[PDB]
Amino acid sequence: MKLYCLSGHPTLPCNVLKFKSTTIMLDCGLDMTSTLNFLPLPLVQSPRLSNLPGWSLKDGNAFLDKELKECSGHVFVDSVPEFCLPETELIDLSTVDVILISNYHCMMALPYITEHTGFTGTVYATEPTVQIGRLLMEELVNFIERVPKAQSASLWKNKDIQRLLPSPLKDAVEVSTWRRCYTMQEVNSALSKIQLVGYSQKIELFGAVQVTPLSSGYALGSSNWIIQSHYEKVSYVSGSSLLTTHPQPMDQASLKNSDVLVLTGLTQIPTANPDGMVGEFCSNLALTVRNGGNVLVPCYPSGVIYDLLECLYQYIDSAGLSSVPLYFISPVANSSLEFSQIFAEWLCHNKQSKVYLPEPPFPHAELIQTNKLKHYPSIHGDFSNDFRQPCVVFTGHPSLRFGDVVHFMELWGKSSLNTVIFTEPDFSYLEALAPYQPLAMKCIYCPIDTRLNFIQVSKLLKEVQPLHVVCPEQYTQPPPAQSHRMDLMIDCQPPAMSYRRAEVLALPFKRRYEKIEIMPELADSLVPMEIKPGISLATVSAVLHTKDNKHLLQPPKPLLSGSIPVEQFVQTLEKHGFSDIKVEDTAKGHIVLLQEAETLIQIEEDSTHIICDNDEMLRVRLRDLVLKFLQKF
Amino acid sequence: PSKSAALHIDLCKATSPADALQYLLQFARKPVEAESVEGVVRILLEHYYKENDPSVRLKIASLLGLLSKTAGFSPDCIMDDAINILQNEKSHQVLAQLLDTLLAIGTKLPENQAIQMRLVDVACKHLTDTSHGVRNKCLQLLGNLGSLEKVQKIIGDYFSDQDPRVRTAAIKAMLQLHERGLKLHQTIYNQACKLLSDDYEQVRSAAVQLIWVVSQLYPESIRLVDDAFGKICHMVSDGSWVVRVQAAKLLGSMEQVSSHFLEQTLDKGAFVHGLEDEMYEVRIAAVEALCMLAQSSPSFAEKCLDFLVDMFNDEIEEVRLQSIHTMRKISNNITLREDQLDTVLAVLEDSSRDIREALHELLCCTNVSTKEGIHLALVELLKNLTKYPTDRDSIWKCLKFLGSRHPTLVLPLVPELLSTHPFFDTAEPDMDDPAYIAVLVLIFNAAKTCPTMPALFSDHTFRHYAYLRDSLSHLVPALRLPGRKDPSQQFLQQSLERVYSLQHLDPQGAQELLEFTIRDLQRLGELQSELAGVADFSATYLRCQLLLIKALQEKLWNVAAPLYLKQSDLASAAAKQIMEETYKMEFMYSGVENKQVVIIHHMRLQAKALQLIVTARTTRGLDPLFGMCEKFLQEVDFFQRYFIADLPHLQDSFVDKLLDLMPRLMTSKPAEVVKILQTMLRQSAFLHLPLPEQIHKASATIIEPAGESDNPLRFTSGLVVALDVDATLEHVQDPQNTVKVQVLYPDGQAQMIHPKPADFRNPGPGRHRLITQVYLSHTAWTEACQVEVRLLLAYNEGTIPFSKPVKVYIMPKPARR
């Protein structure tokens, strides 16, 4: 019953679980914060990025002038951005049997583990999760592909170079395990081994275990999983929004009567207020378009931008700003809005009741019959002859290192008239502006997070209280920013547990009570033999048919208990025909003698001892006589 | 050393889950040992073997197996692993570690007998765990350790064990046994045919493979392959799709079957259900199966013909492309009576470029026996031409092959297809209309065999035949119409011998001979095409020698160093041109070996000597000249080190007698060194270059954009435009790491675009096709200007040009508001 922890980032987790015989590896998150350590990838070269001073160590021995280059007191390594994979060498991942996927945010690491290990098993996920995961995979591989960069940087990974590097480059874990991006073939192959599961589909694995999802509400298609036998249940929650959102609401019913409630995937910033925070979004967006000038929004193709669009649409009807247009620039844009439109039964119950009426669930359709939202695959085409200053532009990857976001982060990043609106968590705000400083572009950190914070985490834990709690130390230890306050933590009173990156934890509950099935002939060939009130007993003897990890019982030793009374023994011997039987007493037992069959029997406390002659019928008669004056176990 | 230090650090720290796991992970992730001392480190792995916390032991023995994968150890590691398996058998994790180490050791290097594959297999078979602890993985252990070419009984009784995972691993062991031969038996057929209904996934997808392999072993059961193939066809109808892929593919591995039961697949039912269920996997597997079993069976092929014409509306480009392939492979003695309408209207699509060229490949290899089919095919392909004036060469090829395949069917078409009015004079059609040319190339490719066709033309048609024969000789063939009824090698050798022998001249005469032979070699390279590469190679070498001699006789070495004319120097740049030319020899030219390499490296050493002496003449700083002398001497050291051989074959050269005076070159003032280098270059002998037998010069032709288009590419300021470049590469080795594109803006700033290896095509052995998109952006212009695009060849640290420039008009505009 072993939890192997392979990911150190709190909300992009990977956890192998050796249960009965299964090796269920929950979630495959690809840590993209490592990509923040590099230079961006512009589709057309800028004079600013090309002409930057190369940093030199004070020793001067290494040829790291061409390796890493500095900008405004911050240095970055100049190559293709690397990706922080989990340990594929802690355990042999070909022995991983079934991979479970919670959401599309923890699916980006799937091609690495599924085509560079030997994993011959199957991966299970909900079909919204696989569709938006496919579109995000194509997004990432297209943006990393467009203008190729060769990994010419290698010497910064050795130990003495990296401890002689300055900050933030010291803050990097296992740079040797970082691997370049993945290609078309393992995109196609990684989405072939996947299978389509439904929300709380009672699905069995290998005849041994049961897995099932639940609604999470973190995103469209997000799932919280349960691995259970009939007598134990370990549940894995990764991302939930019990705050009012668009997808199907969180389930609180299959979480209870469980022992482990692993708290993967909480909020990035506990100190937030999403309704007022998107109010702040509408406020500064309105201010910037009112002064006259575009706004830049780094965004994923899916997720929270959908919610943003809704309120932004509404805010037009409150602002009288129908003149400014809305642009969505992404190579998966039309398919993203399509899959937003279609995956509708997985939304809320009242949103399902909106699907009852023939109306589009997501209101960006109403944005496109009003000619407000314009989606384009790329700048290479229809965007050139339709662009309108000022605008609201939604761009590529929010890490600010690859996509079309780098082009609009240049060009327009020269005047204080414009602003860029960072809205998505798990990417550091000041670190994203680090290659772009010095800079006059207005910046507002306005992050919208839907994941539950520590107050409702406490409510969840006091609602469906487990036997054990598993979480990283970032939930136990006070956060590095607001370390001065104790309040926003995990607040439970069992001893909670803490896992770091690449750690082994034994779950302290032992399997002891398993399950067996009986065919009815044996069930009818059993008798109850009630001896002590309330507590029945029965003798069972069979053979056990073994098949498909669900054991049966088919037809093809019970022992004795209870001290025998000597007086009743000699009385029933006298009444059965035996005669001239003499009894003498000792300190603790009795010696009884039958002259027939030359029999001497001694009785003591929890002890009987018969001694007979060469007889058979009297011997077995004494056997059935003494075994019927007691209780069988 | 490092392994001993790591072991000492691990023993000193001795933390249970902290130091051991992190230390093992760091040891694995940092580097490989790549030495025999790692085997000694295996003894260090034996030092930590006797410890608690078996996760750390599992990681340690995984590291031991990884070290065994480097082939550092041999039998000692095998004995240690056997001792650990026989002693430290403690639960599933240590069992996994030991069996992984045994599997690594068994396939590490030897894979031989004498307790290298037999004793380990016996130990694995004797240590079967009670529940999944080793069972699947000890079965694959006994798989990869074949005992002798006679042990299948232990696999045989394990077809009916508990775990389906262990069933799959027993299956994979049976696979790897068959891949080594081993003369499989007959009862495996019975154990396999009882193994279809396992009532669970992931075994049937391989049980179909077991049925295939024991069926194609030998067909003797009662008839064996018919029952097995019927079972496979039954498995085609399974609900799961992976088993359908496996069933279709593994019946596509079959090659023999009874004929009548093969027609039974379509009527009274496998292929009637085997197509229209799933994505390209099942469909492509089934149609590759019908490819092979239409190739193997000369009969049946009308049935696969009309089971392929239905599946044109599958809305997958991959399915369309591979469907065009699956009927172009089976187009032998097959005609199209009624099913030709859909296959010619399937061309109607917006771009479908690969689909269109595949369709033209299909149309030139098909067979048809009707006249109206020819009429409809011609009018539809002319409609294709009038809708896409892009692929006239491809349609000229397919119409040529269509005329050559069957001439007879188009004889009545000629009175109808062209204006042949009986009494009215037929006006001369437009010669430059590239649609009449296609029907002419049909007509005159179909006119080669049939005699009753010259009488049916007109006078303008014979003059059109004259021009088509003289212009496009590779399209129309020669007819019997009454209207239209090595010295270079010896010359190159004689010229090269005249250059090599005639070297005892006045430098004026040597310069004149060199210049004449340069012009001769360029003219020979332009005239020839088979020997163009060798002529250009010799021209480049003699150009290097010409510039070296011309720089040697210069007025710079007639006055003293302070009396230097900076502007009048001609020998300064000559070093740079000969340096670039040495790059040109060792990276432009395809087929070269070590003799050409050593000669052009020697010429580079002479080039660096010329650069050294001119810089010594220019400057007066003692430290720079001393330093450059030190770099030059270590370059000479590098040259003699890497080329420690071939000095006996190359005689009386600059470098030979350079190394003759080598220790005095070590101990001398740098002025003495540079004067003796001047004296050294004056009687430096001219080397002979043995030309390689097969050489070809690399070059590129950017076929689009042509650059003659007057229309501008128009976009908005600060935004990007993508112009598609298609270029043809010939005789380029490894274009993926070498060839790049360069964009010169008319403002001076340049862009070096690396291509994608996926966008490189390979249209044959020697020519490649680069198709990429070039990304351009600027900050608005006042009129549409000329942006330069050129393909560059890169090498390791440099880039040199090898393509003709092309120019494009670009118009960036501001926004309207």
Q: Is A251 on the interface with B (CB under 8 A)?
A: no
The answer to whether the CB atoms of B163 and A407 lie below 8 A apart is no
The phi and psi torsions of A263 (rounded to 5 degrees) equal: -95, 40
H-run or E-run covering B62: helix B54-68
Residues 36-75 in A contacting B (C-alpha not used; CB under 8 Å): 43-45, 47
Mutate to test the interface with A, among B165, B717, B759, B774 (most CBs of A within 10 A): B165
B573 with B603: CB under 8 angstroms? no
Q: Which residue has the tokens 């929270």?
A: A304
For residue A91, list chain B residues with Cβ-Cβ distance below 8 A: 58
For residue B755, list chain A residues with Cβ-Cβ distance below 8 A: 148
Residues 127-156 in A contacting B (C-alpha not used; CB under 8 Å): 145-150
Distance of CA B425 to the CA centre of its chain: 57
Q: In what order do the strands lie in the sheet with A419-422?
A: A373-376, A326-329, A392-395, A295-298, A419-422, A442-445
For A174-221, the DSSP string reads -GGG-B----HHHHHHHTTSEEEE-TT--EEETTTEEEE--B--SSTT
For residue B62, list chain A residues with Cβ-Cβ distance below 8 A: 89, 92
In angstroms, the CA B554 to CA B570 distance is 8
Q: Quick one: closest CA in B to A383, which residue?
A: B719
**Nearby residues of A599 by Cβ (< 8 Å), 6 or more positions away:** A593, A610, A611, A612, A613, A622
A18 assigned binding-site residue: no
What is the C-alpha end-to-end distance of chain A, expressed in Å? Answer: 33
Peptide bond into A249 cis (omega under 30): no
B65 with B36: CB under 8 angstroms? no
- Identity of the residue numbered A396: G
CA-based nearest residue to B139, from B152, A94, B150, A120: B152
* Determination approach: cryo-EM
In angstroms, the CA B729 to CA B732 distance is 7
Minimum-distance CB partner of A21 among B30, B132, B755: B132
CA-based nearest residue to A44, from B772, B775, B634: B775
Mutate to test the interface with B, among A66, A89, A147 (most CBs of B within 10 A): A89
Rounded to 10 degrees, what is the CA torsion of A97, A101, A104, A109?
Answer: -30
DSSP one-letter code for B116: S
The answer to whether the CB atoms of B21 and A504 lie below 8 A apart is yes
Using CA atoms, how far residue A229 sits from A144, A316, A467, A567, in Å, is 43, 53, 16, 53
For residue A44, list chain B residues with Cβ-Cβ distance below 8 A: 720, 751, 775-777
Q: Per the structure block, which two tokens stand in for B382?
A: 């002319």
Q: Looking at A45-193, which runs of residues are DSSP E strands?
A: 68-71, 74-77, 98-100, 122-126
A414 assigned binding-site residue: no
Distance from CA of A239 to the nearest CA of B (A): 29
User: Exposure pattern of A19-45 as b/e (b: 16+ CB <10 Å)?
Assistant: bbbbbbbbbbbbbbbbbbbbbbbbbbb
Peptide bond into A10 cis (omega under 30): no
A180 assigned binding-site residue: no
Mutate to test the interface with B, among A6, A124, A380 (most CBs of B within 10 A): A380
Length of chain A: 633
Rounded to 10 degrees, what is the CA torsion of B499, B503, B509, B514?
Answer: 30
A104 with A219: CB under 8 angstroms? yes
Length of chain B: 817
CA-based nearest residue to B22, from B49, B55, B50: B55
In angstroms, the CA B543 to CA A360 distance is 75
Q: Per the structure block, which two tokens stand in for B526?
A: 């332009």
Distance of CA A109 to the CA centre of its chain: 13
Q: Per the structure block, which two tokens stand in for A319?
A: 């602002």
Distance from CA of B553 to the nearest CA of A (A): 40
H-run or E-run covering A226: strand A225-228
CA-based nearest residue to B362, from B383, B334, B337, B390: B334
A550 assigned binding-site residue: no
Q: State this model's resolution in angstroms.
A: 4.1
CA-based nearest residue to B442, from B411, B488, B471: B411
In angstroms, the CA B195 to CA B228 distance is 13
In angstroms, the CA A383 to CA A368 distance is 16
B256 with B293: CB under 8 angstroms? no
Residues 152-191 in A contacting B (C-alpha not used; CB under 8 Å): 159, 174, 176-177, 184
**Nearby residues of B596 by Cβ (< 8 Å), 6 or more positions away:** B585, B689, B690, B692
User: Exposure pattern of B73-88 as b/e (b: 16+ CB <10 Å)?
Assistant: bbeebbebbbebbeeb
β-pair partners for B794: B799
In angstroms, the CA A345 to CA A128 distance is 11
Q: Which residue has the tokens 């150009």?
A: B543
CA-based nearest residue to A91, from A13, A15, A177: A15
Q: Quick one: closest CA in A to B775, which residue?
A: A44
Q: Is A95 on the interface with B (CB under 8 A)?
A: yes
Inter-chain Cβ pairs, chain A and chain B, closer than 8 A: 94
Indicate the SS3 state at residue A108: coil
- Which residue numbers in chain B precede an interruption (C–N > 2.5 Å)? 150, 222, 268, 485, 796
Distance from CA of A445 to the nearest CA of B (A): 26
Q: Looking at A355-484, which runs of residues are DSSP E strands?
A: 373-376, 392-395, 419-422, 442-445, 470-472
CA angle, B598 as apex, B595 and B603 as ends, to 5°? 125
CB atoms near residue A535 (< 10 Å): 7
CA-based nearest residue to A146, from A44, A298, A34: A44
Residues 326-365 in A contacting B (C-alpha not used; CB under 8 Å): none
Mutate to test the interface with B, among A177, A324, A379, A405 (most CBs of B within 10 A): A379
In angstroms, the CA A322 to CA B20 distance is 63
Q: Within a 13 Å sphere around the CA of B505, how many CA atoms are in the beta-carbon half?
A: 16
- Which residue numbers in chain A precede an interruption (C–N > 2.5 Å)? 556
Per the rule left: phi > 0, alpha: psi between -120 and 50, beta: everything else, A579 is beta
In angstroms, the CA B738 to CA B587 distance is 10
User: Exposure pattern of A489-528 as b/e (b: 16+ CB <10 Å)?
Assistant: bbebeeebbbbebbbbbebeeeeeeeeeeeeeeeeeeeee
The answer to whether the CB atoms of A547 and B17 lie below 8 A apart is no
B82 with B120: CB under 8 angstroms? yes
Q: Is A492 on the interface with B (CB under 8 A)?
A: no
